[PDB]
Amino acid sequence: AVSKKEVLYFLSSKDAESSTAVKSYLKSLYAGAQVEATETDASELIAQLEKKYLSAQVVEPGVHNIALPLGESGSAPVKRYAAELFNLGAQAGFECPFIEVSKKFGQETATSETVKDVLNKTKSYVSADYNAALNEVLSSVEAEINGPVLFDGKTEGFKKFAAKAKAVAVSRGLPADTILAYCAGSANEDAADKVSKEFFTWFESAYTADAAAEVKAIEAEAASILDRHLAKPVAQIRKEQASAYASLLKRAETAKGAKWAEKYLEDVKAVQWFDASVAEAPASGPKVAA
Amino acid sequence: KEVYCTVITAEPLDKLERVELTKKAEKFVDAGFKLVMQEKIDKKLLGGFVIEFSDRRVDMSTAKKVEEFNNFVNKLVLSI
Amino acid sequence: ADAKALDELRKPKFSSKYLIQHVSQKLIPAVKEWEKSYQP
Amino acid sequence: KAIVDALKASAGDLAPAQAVEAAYGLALSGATDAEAFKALFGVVAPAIEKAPDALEVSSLAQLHVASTISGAKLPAAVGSFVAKAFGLAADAARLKRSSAESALVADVAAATAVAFGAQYRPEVASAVASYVKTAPDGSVLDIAITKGDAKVLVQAVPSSLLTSTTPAKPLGHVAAYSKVREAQGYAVAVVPANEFEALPDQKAKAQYVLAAIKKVAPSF
């Protein structure tokens, strides 16, 4: 059963084992059951923590239903893979990734008064060879000020930094003037769409190149895992993979009554159904009731 | 029969934000002692107050609450 | 037995989702009571 | 009314998910021809009884809008179930709030607390926590005020429910939500954020919200 905060996260979700939890709840409200009152409680810390642990119950089955585009040629299987993660994060309640990491910067550094503190409280979320490349620019601009640069914007010393911080961002490859003119808007919507269509060709070149960099790491992890495995004899592999299957059944068979472990062994029995159903008719595949 | 103290807050206080502040701070002194005040601003605190009695400090700020919250959550999920 | 379904077969099997749920059922009631009993 | 003329005649050419979006967009546009809504609900309501779970909950909420604005009644098991499913799809759109709709609701709830008289920072923060009464269908209303038996609801509509053109009027989906909340006992004063966040100061933002409530319910 659900606690109604799960079933509100599973309404716009699309995966299987959540939508059969929604369809079983939507059939119960139809049969004369009353809907629970949604609690207007658990102030800002518990409210943003339940969002962390309810969106991860939408992301986690959703990531497993997204086929990686490994060993593929072209940019369209990466634009498929990234768009499946865009539409997955939207079903889990996330916003656009540009909107969601810019929210992460202003959350970490609401009280950062110096530019060296905003470069060290948003350190985990910026590429480290870009964060370091903004420290040679911060140390160069610190020479002509000889005082700490403040996070003001109206300060002239911040404009001396942002004259050379923008100089890195174009050299990194990202058009900072098309980013900044997108999030500022424009007056007329005709020239607001000339910057919208140049932000979204950066952004589509942005979300692809790190969806592709996520694939090329899985391609290089699977090729180093396989080439470590092709060097073994076949008898070593058969007993190494039989102990790992035994110790991980045993970890789920010791934990009894837990929800995850009794759902784990229903997956082992459903894997064995797939092998048993293919073994009965292998030119057609598994048998679906249809 | 006084207590000299310093309240460091994130924003300058209102006329009622002070009156609710002393009534909570009045049970940190072990008498009906009049903690006089001192007012300071520190936007590094995320709202709330921290009161330093010059022998002990009570940190009821939110920026100490949201880091003591995370220290309890990250301790608890390392068990579960 | 045989010939199960489609919506039973569409679920990804060994995803976590129930460790995340088991943590969220043991973190949230154990931290809802922490915020209502907290003084520094 | 050439469009509603086709819909009373050809409503067997539609799937139940297509007839809900047919009836909803009529009721949002102010269609009174209840023989069309008898035709459009004769596709939907037989489908909901044999399968209540076949339609998505966002389309069950579009049916409760269509059956309350036009007023054409549903079957007795369906019309209460579609009334429960408006509480779900309005709650799920509250949990997955855009964080500019969260920052606008807490900005409007601040500007409707100082409109009702709150001169200090600790006075608003206990008032905005009192506005979050729950709806009669189990939902959560962010800014719900009661004076005796008279209720006003304040609605904030950020940009996501505004038209993308220059006058920037809100879309039809917010009059959908208002006219359902009005039929539960409320008076919905819409606060559009192209107008609300145009104001320079908080007291001017209170002069926007209090002008919006009295032009809707003058008892407040």
Automatic annotation (TrEMBL), chain A:
This is Mitochondrial ATP synthase associated protein ASA4. It comes from the Eukaryota.
Automatic annotation (TrEMBL), chain B:
Belongs to the ATPase delta chain family. This is Mitochondrial ATP synthase subunit OSCP. It is found in: Membrane. It comes from the Eukaryota.
Automatic annotation (TrEMBL), chain C:
Mitochondrial membrane ATP synthase (F(1)F(0) ATP synthase or Complex V) produces ATP from ADP in the presence of a proton gradient across the membrane which is generated by electron transport complexes of the respiratory chain. F-type ATPases consist of two structural domains, F(1) - containing the extramembraneous catalytic core, and F(0) - containing the membrane proton channel, linked together by a central stalk and a peripheral stalk. During catalysis, ATP synthesis in the catalytic domain of F(1) is coupled via a rotary mechanism of the central stalk subunits to proton translocation. Produces ATP from ADP in the presence of a proton gradient across the membrane. It is found in: Mitochondrion inner membrane. Belongs to the ATPase alpha/beta chains family. It comes from Polytomella sp. Pringsheim 198.80. It comes from the Eukaryota. This is ATP synthase subunit alpha.
